[PDB]
Each structure stands twice: as C-alpha cells, then as structure tokens.
C-alpha cells in the first residue's frame, strides 16, 4: 500500500522486468532511488545483449509506460522522478513511442496525484453531465485566470499573496483605547544591505495607515513605490491599499500586545520570485420538445425489480420500496409504498401513482426512495427498517424530465439513520457495482419533456395574481431562528403578504418555507418575487444554500448575494460550510460551484483551504466524483501552486503511511521501541525530502523548513498522535516563532474539531466586535482525509493535568500562575485567565461539547485558557464545563471566598454579556450548523441535533428569560453561585 502492491518499502535491490518494443524481455537490477532516465540508459545498454537491437531506436525518442497502484497505465514523460515515488503496482516498464503532448500528461499526473485518483477515469466516464461540467467549468476557470492576469504582475501578487485582512475598516472601542492616542509602535526590519545583515527602525504611526505611507515614513526614517511590507516569519504581504490595523497580523498584534515586525522588500524581487501561471487549455474542451406544463397527467413511476437485496430470509419475511417526491427535506406529496413482496425475489412490476401533477412538479423535485424491510410477527407493533436508499433528480441538468428505464444503484444506509427515506443524501447512482440496484421506469410522454424557461414562468406570473397596520408580525417572524415553530397561520400570513415582504429583506428564508412547492402558480409567483428581491446579508444568504432550499433560483439569488456582499475573509471563515453545501446541489454545474471556484482561483489563501476541504472528503464515495471534478478544475487553473500542493500531499501521505506502520503493525510493543522505529523511519532521506521545504496545510503563509529530528515524538494518547517540529529557512524569523509544531492526528476525525474551532473563532469575533475582549485561542486544525488531519500546537502551554502533576491540590494552578509571571503583570495574567475562562465557559455551554477533564483543557504561561480535543459537540441538557474550584481560586485572585468576590461579579457580567451576544447572533450559528448536515458527523445528521443549541441559547424563550436560564445553569454548576 506504499511504493508497491503489498510492499510498503521496496528493498534496495529491485528486479525490474522492462518490456521492449522490439519484443525482448530484460531482468535489470535497478538502483533504489534511481531516476527513470538512467533506468532507460542501462536499459538500452543491455538491450544490445538481446537480439532485435537493430529495430531499436534512440533513447530520447522512447517513453516508459507502467501500471500504477491506482489501476491505470501511466506513461512517463517525467524521467527526472525517482522510482520510489512512481507507485509501481508490478515492476515492469514498457518502452514505446510518444502518444501525446508531454506538458498535458505531466499536468495530468500532477493533478491525479494531488487529488488522489486519476484523471483517466474522469475522461473514460460516460455520464454526459460530467463531461458537460468538465467542458463548461473551464470558461469560469479561464475568466478567473484572466482576472488573475489582468494587472500583471501586481494582480499575480494579489493572487499568490492576498491581503490577510478582516471586514471592518474601523476598530472597536475597547482596542482603540489599547493604543497610546491610537498609535501603533511598529518595527520595520530592513535586511537590504551589501551583506545579509539585519537592521531595524521603529515607527509610531496611526491605525488607518496605508502600507504605502508606512514605507514612506520608513524611507523617511531611513535617511518610492517599489517596496512592499512582508510579515516576519511567514509569507504574508501588505499589498492592496488598506488601513494597517485592518490586517489580521496587525490586528492580532493589537490583540495580544505583541510587537509588529515587518520586512521591507523590493517589488521586483517578489515579482521575479512569482512565476507565470501556464494555464494550458485542456484537450477535452475540444469536444421538438414539449413543455412540462402542457401535460395533463399525474406523475407515476414504475418499479420493476431489484437485482439483489442484502437481507436474510429467515429473519425478515417481506420487503418493499418506499418512495416519495421531495423538494429538499419536505415531501411534495404523500409517500407511496410498493407491495410487500417476499425478500427472496424482489420482483415488483408495479406502477406507483402520486398526489401531484406533471406541471405541479417543481424544478428541484427529487424522487427519494428506499428499499426497506418489515418486521413484527412477535407482538402487535410492526416496524420498518431502512435497507438501501437512493435519490433521482426528476429533472437533469438540461432541464429535461427523466423518462424511460433507469438502473439506480442504491447507497448503504447512513449510520444511525432512523428515517426510512434519506432526502438529505446525495443524488445519482452508486458507482460501486457491488450494491443493490433498482430498475426504475419513468413515464414516456411521446416526446422529451422540458422544464419551462423564465419566459413561460414570468407569463404565468401576473396572471394567477397602503401598508397594513400590523406589520410587526413580519418583523417578529424575521427575528426568529431558521428552525422556529412556524405555523400554517404564519405561513398563510407570509404568503398573503408576500408583496409587502420586500420591505424586510431578511424574511425571505421564512417566506420560501411558506410557499408550497407542489403548486405551479405559487412557484411562479414566488419566482417573480425572487427575481426582484433586494440583496440580503451574506450570513442570511448562506442560509438559502442548505438542504431546505434546493430551488436553483433561490440558490442563484444566494450566490448573487455572495458575489455582491461576501468578502474574502468571511469566505475563508465560512469556507467549510460553503464547501459542505456543494453536496446539496443537485447538479455538478451550478452557480455556487462557479462562485467558489472563481474565488478560489483568485486567492491562494482561499484556494488552499478550498483544495484541502475538497480533498479531506474524497474518501466519501457519495461526493467523490463531484469533488474530484472540482479538484481537477482547481488544479488545472491554479497555476504553479499545484506543485506546492503536490509537496503538501506527499508529506501528508508519507505521514499517513508512517502512522499506518505505527497503528496496525506494531501497536503491541513498548513505546521506546516504537520511538526507535520512528527515528529510523524518519531519518531515511526520501521521507526527509518529502517532509522538507513544503507549505504548511494549516497555514499556507507558514512555509515549513528544516525538520528537527530530536523532538519529533508521540504523545501518550489513545490513538498515538504524531508530534512534528519544523524550523524556518529564513534565519532572522525568531521574532514571531522559531519553531512550527504540528500534531498529525490519524484515527480520530477532525471535522468535528474543525467545526468547533470555526464556531469558537466566530464567537470570538462577535465578542470583540460588541465590546468584549473575550479572546479565544482557535488553534489551526485541518482535516486532510478519513479521520486524519493536522492540529496547530500552542507554544508555552500546558494541560491542567500537567500543572496539577508538576505542582505536587486545589490552589496549585493559581500558585503556578503566581510563580510563572508575578509582579505588576500578575494582575494582567489574572484578568486574562478570568476573561478567557468566561468566554470559553460561555462557548462550551452553548456548544455543549464533550465532558471536560484536566487532560483536554490547557493554560498558557501568560494565563490564557483554552480547550483542546473537542470531538463530541452538542449531543453524543448537560453543562460540560462546570467551573471547578481550581478556576474559582484563580478568578478570585486566590481568595478563599468565591460567592462574595467582586472579580467573580465581573466574571458574571462578562459571561452574561457573552451569552446575550451569542443569543443575538444565534441566527448565524444555527445557519452554520444547518449547512453542516451533509458532511455526516456521528452527532450531526438532522435538525434534531441543532435543537440542542436551540435550547442552550434559549431562542424559544424571550430575551429576558435567557438571563434566568443562564443563572440557573451556572447555579446548578456551582451548587449555588
């Protein structure tokens, strides 16, 4: 499963059996790390020994071909790459003529390696929608490339090194007072000299400073638009003219009080460093219908049979097929069941009729179905269990209704799914042929049935068609959360007042829930309202992209709102959910995929996390094909960064292999022999070359360098995560960090941790904006695959368990914080600990993460408190983070009393303000947790889970009652507090 089939590491002596075009067979002993060109060299040296050497031609005209471990005949125009990285299936190499363009095939190899699956089966798959998407997405790829090359070389620098800023140009009041008259002491580190000698200047400048004037007084103090500002220790650049305090590095320096340090580099140096992206245009781009509404018939679908259903015969008697026409998550008609045939012969031959008409079918209508099994001979209660599920788009990407026969391969039942149907699941047949397959037959209407265009819908609109006193009901419906208890009274009030709903833009998600999509006239009217709807905020706009709104025009309006309001920083914050709602799209080609790709191809910081979020779920076969096509598109149009991504992938897969040979081969012996084997495996040169000089997946600006072998270790946890320590190739980067520690954790899924940390970062942002300096520590976490990912390590921090063990008690943590930093900075550390504790207490109570012990909560030397290893968030009511007396002592400044403590009263005030802030912004949190359902966490499948964060935030109760709810929860935590 490594460099050979069944052999992880090949022996130094390898007997390759190459294949000659003349017809001879060689048995060549090949060098361990040999490149392909010399392999061809002493291939042709011994070719003279065997006959038919006269028919042989020159070395340079011939190319190696072999079958790799991913089942494709790879041919090798890349002779400079070693045989170890070639991933042989068997040691053979056929020597043939050129058969194609060299650059195209090298790019195809790089793309297939970065994705993890070949482009060859993307070429060989015969789905017309797949090929049409592959052809049409190159248009927006070319447009993004042209926009990236619009203002070369400045726009290329913008693409490669985008500004790391946030949305608000202005600053909150609680950090403007953190500066001496709104001045930032900044240090500019000029290395420009005849020798490689560093030297510094100090500037006291404003917060609204453009970097151009920053370098203007930099040159003035030196004692002119050809210099740029680069952040010390990473590849962050200050390019576009923005206020200085708006940048995330400068903002974080204001947050933590650290001294901002910057380069002063020439523009020409970076412009020569950045290369030109050779966007090669791919080869595959070269390659009487009646309306839907004129059909007077009811929708019927014929179930023929199932080829085989994996069910026991002596435990289950009868099986059937439960179907239903859905629009997202709500049925358009009553579910219809087939006759309960015996499970031995799943043979039906049954038409199924529905309480819906052909014109009444909406554009996003889907036939969701499942073979299910009955039970209940013993007892009077009979139960039906899910057995296999599948969804069909009733209209394909060409707006045509499905007709004729269709062999749909069903999907395995999701884990913990009680529901008989799975409308939240993806559409399309299962690519795995070893799955239960069902023959469907859609009715043939003697022609091709096409959904009407916007003209017929608009003509149907305005044909079926002074402000009122009680307009506060519309606002009341608007302010409630997306999962509110919406009545038929409120639905009818919304639909009867849809024309007056345009004056409240943010009521559109509720109004779309009011309209019934099984009605043609209502769908046309609501389309007419959507077409002229005013734009809404991005936080409300991404709500319209979950499974509850599958309509292409609704999602198009949401994508247009994302185009016209959503910024790059908020896109990076919400990239996880926007990637996850790509599965909710019924078609590969849509507006959301175009928006995400266009933004990813004009922003390397956005595109890096875009690539990694798509790559982390290539193991999921439900979305493997769509995300693989999207990854193909990104890797074709990203330019040079693909190579960097390849390096990252190499390191990751190498680490994966290392963790493999750590966790299913030698999990039994002691830890010391495991460490010996660790240093032996990692000392080998190709593992070094894979793990040296590659960009960090956690942060693309942090360019990892030399790997210190002395301190790369394994923790004593259950899954044995791997500690990695990296140097920095630049020599003067001691200002920010001299080390890069990364936890490679495999076995434990990190999508949960990623979601928890993203939500925690968002609560931090809301608290900072409202006026609370409630700083979190959302460390970098990035899942890279199937329960494998990376975690950024917090330097100079220890778990509470380590503090308690090293101190030896209840007073030991406050004593340790007294000893670490005493004096006039002890009060600052105490306030930092109390405030971070209040913020994390509020966040942990609202999110309801897993049980907290001293092992999974850490404290820094400066006093900052934070949480690690979340895992089990929401429910998998219970307050996990009960404020233990170990924290009561530190909050109370070591006072024995805790109830009558003034600092405890300020702690109460901060907690209450935090809870009110999150309750006010809970719409965003409900939206983000609803957008995350299609990922498939073990504790996040349906809205029953999101009801937990609904209850903990007390959204059902009034704003006042949440205060006493928080009172009661904290009093139960403290047994009176």
């Amino acid at each position: 499963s490594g460099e050979l089939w069944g052999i992880h590491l090949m022996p130094p002596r390898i007997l390759v059996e190459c294949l000659l075009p003349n017809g001879m067979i060689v048995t060549l002993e090949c060098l361990r790390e040999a490149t392909l060109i010399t392999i061809k060299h002493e291939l042709f040296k011994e070719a003279r020994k065997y006959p038919l050497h006269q028919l042989l031609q020159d070395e340079s005209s011939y190319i190696f071909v072999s079958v790799t471990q991913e089942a494709e005949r790879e041919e090798f125009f890349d002779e400079t790459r070693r045989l170890c990285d070639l991933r042989l299936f068997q040691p053979f190499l056929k020597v043939i003529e050129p058969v194609g363009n060299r650059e195209e095939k090298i790019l195809n190899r790089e793309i297939g390696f970065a994705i993890g699956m070949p482009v060859c089966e993307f070429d060989m798959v015969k789905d017309p929608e797949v090929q049409d998407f592959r052809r049409n997405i190159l248009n927006v790829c070319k447009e993004a490339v042209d926009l990236r090359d619009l203002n070369s070389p400045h726009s290329r620098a913008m693409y490669v090194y985008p500004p790391n800023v946030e949305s608000s140009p202005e600053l909150p009041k609680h950090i403007y007072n953190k500066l001496d008259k709104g001045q930032i002491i900044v240090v500019i580190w000029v290395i420009v000299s005849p020798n490689n000698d560093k030297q510094k200047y100090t500037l006291k400048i404003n917060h609204d400073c453009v970097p151009e004037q920053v370098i203007a007084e930099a040159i003035r103090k030196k004692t002119q638009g050809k210099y740029i500002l680069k952040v010390c220790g990473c590849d962050e650049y200050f390019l576009e003219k923005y206020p200085l305090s708006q940048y995330k590095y400068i903002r974080s320096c204001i947050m933590l009080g650290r001294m901002p340090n910057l380069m002063l580099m020439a523009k020409e140096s970076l412009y020569s460093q950045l290369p030109m992206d050779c966007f090669t245009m791919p080869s595959y781009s070269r390659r009487s219908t009646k309306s839907l509404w004129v059909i007077n018939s009811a929708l019927r679908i014929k179930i023929l049979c199932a080829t085989y259903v994996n069910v026991n015969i002596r435990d289950i008697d009868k099986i059937y097929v439960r179907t239903g026409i859905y629009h997202g998550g709500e049925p358009l008609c009553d579910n219809v069941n087939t006759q309960r045939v015996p499970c031995s012969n799943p043979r039906w031959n049954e038409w199924l009729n529905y309480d819906i008409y052909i014109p009444d079918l909406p554009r996003a209508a889907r036939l969701c179905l499942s073979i299910c099994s009955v039970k209940g001979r013993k007892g009077a209660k009979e139960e039906h269990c899910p057995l296999a599920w599948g969804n069909i788009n009733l209209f394909d990407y060409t707006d045509t209704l499905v007709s004729g026969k269709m062999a749909l391969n069903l999907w395995p039942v999701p884990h913990g799914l009680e529901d008989l149907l799975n409308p939240i699941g993806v559409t399309g047949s299962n690519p795995n042929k070893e799955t239960p397959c069902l023959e469907l037959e859609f009715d043939w209407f003697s022609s091709v049935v096409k959904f009407p265009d916007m003209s017929v819908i608009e003509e149907h609109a305005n044909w079926s068609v002074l402000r009122e006193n009680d307009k506060e009901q519309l606002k009341a419906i608007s302010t409630r959360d997306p999962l509110s208890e919406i009545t038929e009274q409120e639905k009818d009030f919304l639909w009867s007042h849809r024309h007056y709903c345009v004056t409240i833009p943010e009521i559109l998600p509720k109004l779309l829930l009011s309209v019934k999509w099984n009605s043609r006239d209502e769908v046309a009217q609501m389309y007419c309202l959507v077409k002229d709807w005013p734009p809404i905020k991005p936080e409300q706009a991404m709500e319209l992209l979950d499974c509850n709104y599958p309509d292409p025009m609704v999602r198009g309006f949401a994508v247009r709102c994302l185009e016209k309001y959503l910024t790059d920083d908020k896109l990076s914050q919400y990239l996880i959910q926007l990637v996850q709602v790509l599965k909710y799209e019924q078609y590969l080609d849509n507006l959301l995929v175009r928006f995400l790709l266009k933004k990813a191809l004009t922003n390397q910081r956005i595109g890096h996390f875009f690539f990694w979020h798509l790559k982390s779920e290539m193991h999921n076969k439900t979305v493997s094909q769509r995300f693989g096509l999207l990854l193909e598109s990104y890797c074709r149009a990203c330019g040079m960064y693909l190579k960097h991504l390849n390096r990252q992938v190499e390191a990751m897969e190498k680490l994966i292999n290392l963790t493999d040979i750590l966790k299913q081969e030698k999990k039994d012996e002691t830890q010391k022999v495991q460490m010996k084997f660790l240093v032996e495996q990692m000392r080998r040169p190709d593992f070094m070359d894979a793990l040296q000089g590659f960009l960090s997946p956690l942060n693309p600006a942090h360019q990892l360098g030399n790997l210190r072998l002395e301190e790369c270790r394994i923790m004593s946890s259950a899954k044995r995560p791997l500690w990695l320590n990296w140097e920095n190739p630049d020599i003067m980067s001691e200002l920010l960090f001299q080390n890069n520690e990364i936890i490679f954790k495999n076995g434990d899924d990190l999508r949960q941790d990623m979601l928890t940390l993203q939500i925690i970062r968002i609560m931090e942002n809301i608290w900072q904006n409202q006026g609370l300096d409630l700083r979190m520590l959302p460390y970098g976490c990035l899942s890279i695959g199937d329960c494998v990912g990376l975690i950024e390590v917090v330097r100079n921090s220890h778990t509470i368990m380590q503090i308690q063990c090293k101190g030896g008690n209840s007073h030991t943590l406050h004593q340790w914080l007294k000893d670490k930093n005493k004096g006039e900075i002890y009060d600052a550390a105490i306030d930092l600990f109390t405030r971070s504790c209040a913020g994390y207490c509020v966040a942990t109570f609202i999110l309801g993460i897993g049980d907290r012990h001293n092992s999974n909560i850490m404290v820094k030397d400066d006093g900052q408190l934070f949480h690690i290893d979340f895992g089990h968030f929401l429910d998998h009511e219970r307050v996990p983070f009960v404020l233990t007396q170990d924290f009561l002592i530190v909050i109370s400044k070591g006072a024995q009393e805790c109830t009558k403590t003034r600092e405890f009263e300020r702690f109460q005030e901060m907690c209450y303000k935090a809870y009110l802030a999150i309750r006010q912004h809970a719409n965003l949190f409900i939206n983000l947790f609803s957008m995350m359902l299609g990922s498939g966490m073990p504790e996040l499948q349906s809205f029953d889970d999101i009801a937990y964060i609904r209850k903990t935030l007390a959204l059902d109760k009034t704003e006042q009652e949440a205060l006493e709810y928080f009172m009661k929860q904290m009093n139960d935590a403290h047994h009176g507090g």
């Binding site: 059996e17 065997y50 471990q69 089942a71 053979f92 069910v311 395995p412 038929e488 059902d956």
Partner: protein, 276 residues
C-alpha cells in the same frame, strides 16, 4: 364525551419538543394529530400538530378573552371542543386547501399497555434488562459496522488491484502481439542464415515471457477468487447488520417507552440513572 379537561385527553401530550413529536408523527397516515404546549412556553397556546401530504403541519390555537380558536373569531370554549369539532368535521373550514380530517390521535394511553409489572422495582429491573440487552446489541452492531467498513475498504483495494491486473494483462498481451508481429515475417531470415543459438535464445526469451504472463494470470485469478470470497463475507456482514437493526430499533423504543412511563409515574430519575 361531551366535555373533558385537556389533561385527561388522549391527544394532548403537554410539555414536549418538536423532535419527539416528529418521531411520533413519522411515516404515519394522513390526519394523524396531537396537541402539545408551544415551544415559546407560556400558558394558553396549546399548538396542534397534524400530518398532511407527508408533512408535519403545525397549527396555532389562540387564547384571546379566555376562548380558543384557529383564527379570528375565537368560537370555542376549550381546546377539547375544537379538537372534537375538527375530528367530526373537516378542517377545510379554516383553510380549504387543507382538505383533511383529524382521524387518528397520538394517544399516550396507547403505549401504557406495552409496559407490565407496574410496581417500581419490577419496572426498574425490566428497564435494566432491556437497557443492557440494548447495550450488547448496540456494541454488536458497531463492531459489525467496523468490520463492514474494513471489508468495504478491502473490496475497494482488491477491485483496484484486479483492474490493475487486467491492464497489466493488456500491456503484456500487447507486448506478445508486437513480438509476434516483428517475429512472424523475420524468422525466415533466421532460417536462411541458419544459426540455432540465436533461435534457442529467442525461444528462451519467449518462454520466460510466457512464464511471466502465466504467473500474472495465476495471481489475477487467485486474487479474483479472494475478492469473490471476501465479497461473500461482506454480503454476510451486511445481512447480519440488517438483521440486527430492527431488533436494536425495537429495544430503543422499549427503553424510551419505559423511561417515559417511569417519568410520568413520578419515579425518581436519579434512582434509576445509576443502575443503567
């Protein structure tokens, strides 16, 4: 029944959330309904959940001037009178598009006959037995799921290996075809020049190529047989999980019903929590 308090009504359920209502309104017939307190949690709402078109429609009842009704005007003394009136007459009076009768109420009295041995220690012991049996059933189901996922990865890897083997056979058969193509019309030159050493070494090369391709055939056939056997085991594990799943769901329903009955019977929750 002329008029009865809503606490004694079978359709009324009191203080529950939307989730258990959806679980009790899941895949039921048209007109199935219940009445519960609204999630806003103030006295006098008493919302109604009905099932129509496969959807859990939810209707609000107002409490103006001490009366009840779906909308203005409120012409019902109690919620029970309204429920009976819409149980005998269709709900289309309020909204003509909701052509549905309130046919079946979700009665909490229906599940009372499921539990037996009503004394406290007997139901405690019975809840303990069904809870632990649910525990071994669940751990068996998760172990079977783990084995199923591992075997599915083995099927994927083995199928990839078979496809690589077929492409290797295509490669080597193309090589043999090229050998025949460059040897069929060229062995006559060997016949004219009359050297047997080159003939015997080229036949040795052809023989070792034939041995290699036959060995690769043997490996592909063996791995195909292994894939068929492992896929049969995969089918058996899938069948075993599909057999366990209804039993696990029934044990979950039994445990939930026992816990709800104990909660409504006034049994202490902490006294039963630590038995598990």
């Amino acid at each position: 029944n002329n008029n009865m308090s809503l606490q004694d009504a079978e359709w009324y359920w009191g203080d529950i959330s939307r989730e258990e209502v959806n679980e009790k309104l899941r895949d039921t017939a048209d007109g199935t309904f219940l009445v519960r307190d609204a999630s806003t949690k103030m006295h006098g709402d008493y919302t109604l959940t009905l099932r129509k078109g496969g959807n859990n429609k939810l209707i609000k009842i107002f409490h103006r001037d001490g009366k009840y009704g779906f909308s203005d005007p409120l012409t019902f003394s109690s919620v029970v009178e309204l429920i009976n009136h819409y149980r005998n007459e269709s709900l289309a009076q309020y909204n003509p598009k909701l052509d549905v009768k309130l046919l079946y109420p979700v009665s909490k009295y229906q599940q009372d006959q499921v539990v037996k041995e009503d004394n406290i220690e007997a139901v405690g012991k019975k809840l303990h037995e069904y809870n632990t049996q649910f525990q071994e059933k669940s751990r068996e189901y998760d172990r079977l799921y783990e084995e199923y996922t591992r075997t599915s990865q083995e099927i994927q890897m083995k199928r990839t290996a078979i496809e690589a083997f077929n492409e290797t056979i295509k490669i080597f058969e193309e090589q043999c075809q090229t050998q025949e193509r460059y040897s069929k019309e060229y062995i006559e030159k060997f016949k004219r020049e009359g050297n047997e050493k080159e003939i015997q070494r080229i036949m040795h090369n052809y023989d070792k190529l034939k041995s290699r391709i036959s060995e690769i055939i043997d490996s592909r056939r063996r791995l195909e047989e292994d894939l068929k056997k492992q896929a049969a085991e995969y089918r058996e594990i899938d069948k075993r999980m599909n057999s366990i799943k209804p039993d696990l769901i029934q044990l979950r329903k039994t445990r939930d019903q026992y816990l709800m009955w104990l909660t409504q019977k006034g049994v202490r929750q902490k006294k039963l929590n630590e038995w598990l």
